[PDB]
Write a protein that binds this DNA or RNA. Structure first.
Ligand code: NA
Ligand code: NA
Length: 321
DNA sequence: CCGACGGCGCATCAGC
DNA sequence: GCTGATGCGGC
DNA sequence: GTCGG
């Protein structure tokens, strides 16, 4: 049904980027999604409305797509110079809906236009602009392994006692990634515990020209850009990388959460509820009889998390659902 | 019929 | 100058 | 825009 899920996703983005209606953005995603995983060529909009998250207005949109191969509102909005430009510019990392709009108000509508107006961009947006196309490229697993090597090596070299895990879908065995998400902890850093801990790891990864730019950086979260060293060969794209410092006693919660997937964490947070628990990125708590959660139970490996909700450890390899 | 639809870090703005 | 709000990213 | 209370 690619005709329909593209439509729905195209519609999704205009809501986010142009109407600034976050909830309609998601409404449309949920429907793309449910339809994307639905094992039949959809014959009518009535057929589709059965699926949860497909309601009346989308049902009519299907019906118009199916009969005519388009949507009047969609064609119409694609040709709108203002709107289609506001939508496009938000593709630059650091330009969201508010800033894309303000730009288009003053005539800034293309990358070119941003290029001639560097002075009206903030740090984040220059970097987004500069790597506009690298940022939209995927990363092969191979390159990810090559990147993992560099990070794990360099972290251990700052302090042998650090623990770093690369999570995301890559940890789940995914053939390609969108960025690198690194979770970093250290025994001297607990919920009750230097401002140097994240800084020293970033410092090292810059020293060896692995980290090339900085989107933002604090005591507990770094977001920026990285690049494998070029092998006589054509150089590697610049890649998004984030790095987070988590307290040693919340790491394995972090690791699980930042491993996903979504569809996984839903079921697990709905099973945790069944066997009576509440499980966030930081902690698991045992809810009371009215619904008053008490003490976050300790966690010391990915293993634990499962014992507490009574489950057989699922390997990251198959955590799609 | 009408409110929920998520939280949090950091950079940067708006208000005192 | 300080605090708190808002934009953003993207889980 | 959809759902559900
Ligand atoms: Na975007
Ligand atoms: Na953007």
């Amino acid at each position: 049904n690619g005709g329909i899920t593209d439509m729905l996703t195209e519609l999704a983005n205009f809501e986010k980027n142009v109407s600034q209606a976050i909830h309609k953005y998601n409404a449309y995603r949920k429907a793309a999604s449910v339809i994307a995983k639905y094992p039949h060529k959809i014959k009518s909009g009535a057929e589709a409305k059965k699926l949860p998250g497909v309601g009346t207005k989308i049902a009519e949109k299907i019906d118009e797509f199916l009969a005519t191969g388009k949507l009047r509102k969609l064609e119409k909005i694609r040709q709108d110079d203002t709107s289609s430009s506001i939508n496009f510019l938000t593709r630059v990392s650091g330009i969201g809906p508010s800033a894309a709009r303000k730009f288009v108000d003053e005539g800034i509508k293309t990358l070119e236009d941003l290029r001639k107006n560097e002075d009206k961009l903030n740090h984040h947006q220059r970097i987004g602009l500069k790597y506009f196309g690298d940022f939209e490229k995927r990363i092969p697993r191979e390159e990810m392994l090559q990147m993992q090597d560099i990070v794990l090596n360099e972290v251990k070299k700052v302090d042998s006692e650090y623990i770093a895990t690369v999570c995301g879908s890559f940890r789940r065995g995914a053939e390609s990634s969108g960025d690198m998400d690194v979770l970093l902890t250290h025994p001297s850093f607990t919920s009750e515990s230097q401002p140097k801990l994240l800084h020293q790891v970033v410092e090292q990864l810059q020293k060896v020209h692995f980290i090339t730019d900085t989107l933002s950086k604090g005591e507990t979260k770094f977001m920026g850009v990285c690049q494998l060293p070029s092998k006589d060969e054509k150089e590697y794209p610049h890649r998004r990388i984030d790095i987070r410092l988590i307290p040693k006693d919340q790491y394995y919660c972090g690791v699980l959460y930042f491993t996903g997937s979504d569809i996984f964490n839903k079921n697990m947070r709905a099973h945790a509820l069944e066997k009576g628990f509440t499980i966030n990125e930081y902690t698991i708590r045992p809810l009371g009889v009215t619904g008053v959660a008490g003490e976050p139970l300790p966690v010391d490996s990915e293993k634990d998390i499962f014992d507490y909700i009574q489950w057989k450890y699922r390997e990251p390899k198959d955590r799609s659902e």
